[PDB]
Amino acid sequence: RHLKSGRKLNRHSSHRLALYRNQAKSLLTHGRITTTVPKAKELRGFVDHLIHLAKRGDLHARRLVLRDLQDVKLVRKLFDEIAPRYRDRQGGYTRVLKLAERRRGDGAPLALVELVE
Amino acid sequence: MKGILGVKVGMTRIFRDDRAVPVTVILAGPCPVVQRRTPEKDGYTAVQLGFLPQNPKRVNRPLKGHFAKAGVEPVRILREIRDFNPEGDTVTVEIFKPGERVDVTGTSKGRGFAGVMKRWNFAGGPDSHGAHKIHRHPGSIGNRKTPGRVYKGKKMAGHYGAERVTVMNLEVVDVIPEENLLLVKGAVPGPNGGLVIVRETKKA
Amino acid sequence: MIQPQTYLEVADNTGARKIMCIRVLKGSNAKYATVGDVIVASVKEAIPRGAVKEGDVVKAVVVRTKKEVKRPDGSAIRFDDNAAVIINNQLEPRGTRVFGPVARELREKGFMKIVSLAPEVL
Amino acid sequence: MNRGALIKLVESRYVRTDLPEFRPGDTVRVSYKVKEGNRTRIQDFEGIVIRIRRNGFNTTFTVRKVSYGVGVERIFPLHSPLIQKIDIVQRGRARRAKLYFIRNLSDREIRRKLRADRKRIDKDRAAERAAKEEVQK
Amino acid sequence: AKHPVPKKKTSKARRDARRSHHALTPPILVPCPECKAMKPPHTVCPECGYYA
RNA sequence: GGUGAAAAGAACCCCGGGAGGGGAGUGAAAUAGAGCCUGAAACCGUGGGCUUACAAGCAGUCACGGCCCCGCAAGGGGUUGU
RNA sequence: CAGUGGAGGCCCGAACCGGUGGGGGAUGCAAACCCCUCGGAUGAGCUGGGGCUAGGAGUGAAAAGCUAACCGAGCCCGGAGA
RNA sequence: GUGCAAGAGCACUCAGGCGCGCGGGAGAACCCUCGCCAAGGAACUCUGCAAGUUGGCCCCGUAACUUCGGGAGAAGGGGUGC
RNA sequence: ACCGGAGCGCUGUCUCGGCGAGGGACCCGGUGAAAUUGAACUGGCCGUGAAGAUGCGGCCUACCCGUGGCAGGACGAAAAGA
RNA sequence: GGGGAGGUUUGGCACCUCGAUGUCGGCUCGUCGCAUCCUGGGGCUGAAGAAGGUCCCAAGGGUUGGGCUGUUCGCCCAUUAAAGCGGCACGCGAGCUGGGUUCAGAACGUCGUGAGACAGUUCGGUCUCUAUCCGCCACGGGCGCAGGAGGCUUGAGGGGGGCUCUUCCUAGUACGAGAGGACCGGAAGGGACGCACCUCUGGUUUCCCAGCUGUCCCUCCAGGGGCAUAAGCUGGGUAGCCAUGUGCGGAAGGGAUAACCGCUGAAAGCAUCUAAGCGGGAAGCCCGCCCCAAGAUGAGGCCUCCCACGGCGUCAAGCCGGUAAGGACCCGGGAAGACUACCCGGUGGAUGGGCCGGGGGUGUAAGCGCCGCGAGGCGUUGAGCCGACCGGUCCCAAUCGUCCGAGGUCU
């Protein structure tokens, strides 16, 4: 019997690892994102790390966040806009509002991933 | 028939004189005698201990009359030690001198819908030379025509864990009145943060 | 943890230089053995004109092992090899000068000469 | 109740202090309490530390030597009332937490894989003999 | 086809019997403050929105 | 193989992207609406009456009772509890 | 003897040709498959194209194998409603 | 195209072309495929079936027997990177 | 890639199993088969009967309806016994 | 020489089954029988003691690992308290194997001119993904339990468990010429199996940390990412799940007994364990232990909370909207789990996510500076990285709300 631990996912190791990244990239571009409750709830955590990481400055943190996302120009958008707006706010750099419309032809539940303002 | 409730905080080990005593930790934070049972009007004897304080928010239930009847701060849980009548107050850990042996019940780790190999330490099959569709299979279950049924309770694949269990004759190793903790011998069912009753032992 | 088939050494000037286990004397059907436990075993090699010959079905006590014993004091101990000293049925060690580390356990099991003679009971 | 951990540290009073620091990869001996019949010893166990695994209480290092031709590995809880001394005997540059590998080349191959942290030694001879002057005069 | 197969056509009464809990429980909804419209509980839905 | 006496093969409106229906209209007949005369049985459904959750079965059948139903009345049917 | 020399139903190993062992597959992806391993791999090699040989007949490094997915005698029609 | 003694090998990758025409989640047993393992090391079992060890190159070195070709990659062992 | 005996190496073959990964299984949405099927309102035992009974007899236990699993029975399916 | 019993053996008869009832042996899973292999209890003895022989009681439990063999069997080896026997379609192929055997190839001895044949041998040879019903192991939904609720319980009735070795004291005492060597009671260890546990030991730990090759890539150096498996590879690993690892249990004791040992005592002036009465006596039976359990339709009990009609039905049970206790919905989640159920929690909130501290794991990041032609090395450094575990923090997320649910029959 499994799960006595704590975590979720569907996909293999290196897929899901990319998944979170191809979501981060979108999240950190469109600001609002609308996938499935699970992915969403997972995106949640992931980016929160980076954001909180970008709330720090030194070039090391940058390279460390630049390790997930890849566009060196996106990371600029992070340390040159986002995080600066998250000072005086410790943690909770995201929000996951669940929409009430499912996808047609797989009855998938949906939601939102918002950079909290 | 002494008896006190608690939880399973966690377990490590100590050193008695110079030998190592692997201990587990139980918690008998003062327990309120909530109701008793006189054969006079119950059919037997037993004292129901309550446990773990509680804001009168989830207590909104009619249990509040029940506590207010027994002048008892509104707890969260309560069960019956058999024939354990102390005195008009409440039971600490002062009940168990260090050294005394205790019987310890508790609910086991739920191991989901487990396999035969797991449930009943069955044998299943050979990882090897044939079949490769039975390696954790039960095997045969019955006989040919006669009987033609299967024995009620033939060890098969089901749920393993989440059942009431007791473990007995345990050496209470130390008792911490100062902060209500109970040292035992280590092997005690249930996970951490787990509810468990403890009572004097069956030795004589 | 030595079990029936396992290759032990010979912590002594007995004659054998390597024996396989044959049966664990312990219970009527114990799974294994450990330092201080006895086993019937077979000699799979021996120095020429040794007191013991090859093929000799011997009784040997374990001195060392590759699976750590647990000391009631929470400690442990494990050697780099499974070893044995061969013994006259009275459980008296057959070699003269034994050699090779051994386990404190033996001292509680009637086997003085093994550890008396032994260099370093550890 | 809010402190599932601090409850066992309430137990924690069976914990030592005087014992020196000794990260894994340096030769250290440890005088050990044993029973030779009905008396008590101080068995000098001197060897290289092969693995420390931590847990506040019940945390164990494991030493390793080569007693008379053959090699051994005793275990030692870091808080066992059965350890009189524990004079380390030479710091060592380790470069890895659990050094099991030394099993298959304990010899004149080891003497080139664990030189010595000429770094921690500095601290020692300094702190030691320098704390003396603050305890003497 | 292979090994296990039905030994008997399933009596309609037993088929319609196995259906017992087929029925689907209609979606749970509640009016919302924003509009007089219907929403599922804990869901952001059109003709409305929210607050931050 | 089959509408119909005749295409008179359903204008227009309505919902619907369509399919498809609802009114209006044609026709003696549209439950003759187009694979459409007749429309059987299996089989699938919706509403109603009776009936079932301590009960053991080739399912029917005697016997009585309750309920529901046509009938002045006596009676007849449907169901089925024992 | 050394050098050169570059023979071989020689050697390792792709393509290609096989199908040994095991696992899967068994209303299969498949009326013969999938994976791991394995055999030959300049020869009695493999293969495209154009051609000839067939029913008691052919072909056959021989199993009674093959001859249009069941060959101790093909398939279709026919005597035949044996 | 680059790297490995070489290569149509392998790994990654050009130009090019695809993600295999059901998706969503949950992370029970059980099956497949797969990775690891304490101590033992064929006790398994009809059988080391399977799996595992070994592997490339260069070097040292190589038994019986022999048709004097072979046995030979016998066996065992060292080196490899920067 | 014949069949047999043993020895070294090495191993989940085994003692003895454990944990982990992925594809199914499982839950939701779309799609939606199959052999089989006298009819079923299909329990246990000891009998009994064409001699191996849910269906006869006596006795016993059984509230109705299912979902995931096991494969003992329905002399289960399959093929008018090789 | 006689009489049986059983229905495990070899047969006999040919009754069901040839529009199919898959045969040997093993693995798995067993269950039952007693005619008992062991352990417990007895009678006798050609029983000193110890040991053993035989009969009796007794299934509760246990009944080993290998060598050979297709084997069942048996032989052997090392043990053991013992290494029991049989039933169950020679239990078990819709559970597995396929060595054996009964296919087509092939050969050997062999009979046969022969084609072929052989309870003679030898090599090889295709065991079918999908369970309707019963039975079974698990989990639910509906209804029930004559007010409706929340919580705690009684245990009818079931199940589980049940084993057993060695050693020291009593004592080297009774015993015996000695060797040998006890009853009895007492004490400490061990095997195997069971249950639970993760503290230690020890495994996994799938992207927790680092190391490495090749490659392509961002961005040229440093720094990094993809891929090499669905982890590229190697070293290492908390939580969790785990066994080799840790704790526990098999009892004690009460009662009724088996064989058996006995008190009193006739029938029958004695005697008799018996026909009246009574007592002692097994690991077995009944409690005891653990778990299941009021669908215990015979539906229990205990404490506490809510409490008339608000409208149609005159008479009758009913019927309708709102309500009380409270329950449910939904959402957030759990060492709960397939689903469902179960459990905590839901802004009065720490419920996950985040953030921080601690734990723990990796083992001195990046950058910069110093040294070396250089690969590197040294420091700043136990640094940087840092899932699960232990706590805190309302930053994000369980906001708002809907439905349901008493009106309490009769004697």
Which of B101, B116, B118 has its CA nearest to residue B184? B101
C-alpha–C-alpha distance, residues B86 and B100, integer Å? 18
Count other C-beta atoms under 10 Å from residue D2's C-beta: 4
Q: Across the interface, do B29 and D82 touch by the CB < 8 Å criterion?
A: no
C-alpha–C-alpha distance, residues E23 and E33, integer Å? 31
D68: amino acid identity, one letter: Y
User: B162 CB contacts (<8 Å, ≥6 apart)?
Assistant: B107, B108, B109, B110, B111
C-alpha–C-alpha distance, residues B78 and A82, integer Å? 52
Element (H, E) at D44: strand D43-48
Residue indicated by tokens 């030379």? B129
C-alpha–C-alpha distance, residues B95 and B91, integer Å? 7
Query: Which of chain D's residues have a Cβ under 8 Å away from the Cβ of B179?
Result: 7, 10
Q: Is E47 exposed, middle or buried (0-12, 13-18, 19+ CB in 10 A)?
A: exposed
Experimental method: X-ray
Q: What is the resolution of this structure in A?
A: 3.8
Q: Report the b/e string of B75-95 with b at 16+ CB within 10 A.
A: beebbbbeebebeeeebebeb
C-alpha–C-alpha distance, residues E12 and E6, integer Å? 15
CA distances from C120 to B25, B96, C116, D10 (A): 40, 45, 9, 40
Residue indicated by tokens 């007791």? B166
C1' (I38) to CA (A93) span, angstroms: 71
Nucleic acid strand J: bases within 7 A of protein CB: 27-31, 64-65, 77-83, 88-98, 128-141, 149-155, 159-160, 165, 190-202, 206-207, 218-219, 223-228, 230-232, 235-237, 239-242, 244-249, 251-252, 289-292, 300-305, 325-327, 329-338, 344-346, 348-349, 352-356, 359-367, 378-379, 382, 384-385, 387-393, 395-402
Longest dimension (CA), chain A: 47
Count other C-beta atoms under 10 Å from residue C74's C-beta: 21
Query: Which of chain B's residues have a Cβ under 8 Å away from the Cβ of C74?
Result: 13, 15, 20
User: A78 CB contacts (<8 Å, ≥6 apart)?
Assistant: A28, A50, A51, A54, A65, A69
> Long-range CB contacts (< 8 A, 24+ apart) of A40-49?
A40/A96, A40/A98, A40/A111, A40/A112, A40/A113, A41/A8, A41/A96, A41/A111, A42/A8, A42/A9, A43/A94, A43/A96, A43/A113, A44/A94, A44/A96, A44/A113, A46/A20, A47/A93, A47/A94, A48/A91, A48/A92, A48/A93, A48/A94
Chain B: list its partners (3+ Cβ pairs within 8 Å): A, C, D
Quick check: B115 CB within 7 A of strand H? yes
- Residues of chain E whose C-beta is under 8 A from some C-beta in A? 39-40, 42-45, 50, 52
Which of D123, D117, D99 has its CA nearest to residue D47? D99
C-alpha–C-alpha distance, residues E3 and B62, integer Å? 59
C1' (H81) to CA (D108) span, angstroms: 22
